[PDB]
Amino acid sequence: KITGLLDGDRVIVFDKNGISKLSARHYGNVEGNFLSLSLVEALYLINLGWLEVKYKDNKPLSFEELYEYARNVEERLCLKYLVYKDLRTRGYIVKTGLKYGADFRLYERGANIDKEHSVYLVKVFPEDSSFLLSELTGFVRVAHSVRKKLLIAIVDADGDIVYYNMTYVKP
């Protein structure tokens, strides 16, 4: 069970092999002799039984413990977490979509991250919260501007994720 260190909004890994294992599956970003995982990533790794996270004492935090800490640091933690876990489970390599204002950005399944770029821009939405339609049309424009497809991930009232693809059309 690889070990990581709770450092604010990130979790660091230094074990040489621990970092090699996680970099292979493409988790977090490698910065020198360290690997930086996001809080959602660490939670999912913990859930997978691969990662172990300690903060203060030598006693590693529990999923609940890390959740309690992250919910007060990250925003929409549960929203991003449920969906991230889903996509990871669907076989996707999920990476931040921050650069495009999106929640995530994904590579095709089975994509060679080496030569391939990301294809989907993902934006998560809770079913029961209304918002400006321009919020959506805006993402369709950004996605399109970067030759990427927009993926709307809805977390319905039942806690399940429903995905929709939205695009421009010329009747």
Q: Minimum CB separation from a second copy for residue 142, in Å?
A: 5
Tokens standing for residue 133: 């339609």
What is the smallest separation between the CB atom of 42 and Au ion, expressed in angstroms? Answer: 12
Distance, CA of 128 to CA of 130 (rounded, Å): 7
Q: Is 10 in the site for Au ion (CB under 5 A)?
A: yes
Q: Are strands 60-61 and 51-54 parallel, antiparallel or unpaired?
A: antiparallel
Q: Which of residues 52-111 bind a second copy (CB under 8 A)?
A: 56, 63-64, 67-68, 71-80, 82, 85, 87, 90, 92, 95-103, 106, 109
Residues 115-144 that bind Au ion (CB under 5 A): none
Q: Which of residues 75-114 bind Au ion (CB under 5 A)?
A: 78-79
The interface partner of residue 142, options being Au ion, a second copy, none and the CB cut-off 5 to 8 Å by kind, is a second copy
For residue 117, indicate whether it is catalytic. Answer: yes
The interface partner of residue 111, options being Au ion, a second copy, none and the CB cut-off 5 to 8 Å by kind, is: none
Q: Which amino acid is at 12?
A: I
Comparing C-alpha atoms, which of 94, 112, 79 is closest to residue 45? 94
95 is catalytic: no
- The answer to whether residue 107 is catalytic is yes
Q: Which is nearer to Au ion, 119 or 161 (CB)?
A: 161
List the x/- string, 133-152, binding to a second copy by CB under 8 A: xxxxxxxxxx--xx----x-
Instruction: With CA atoms as reference, report the closest residue to 149 among 121, 127, 171, 124.
Output: 121
H, E, C per residue of 57-108? CCCEECHHHHHHHHCCCCCCHHHHHHHHHHHHHCCCEEEECHHHCCCEEEEC
> What are the catalytic residues?
107, 117, 148
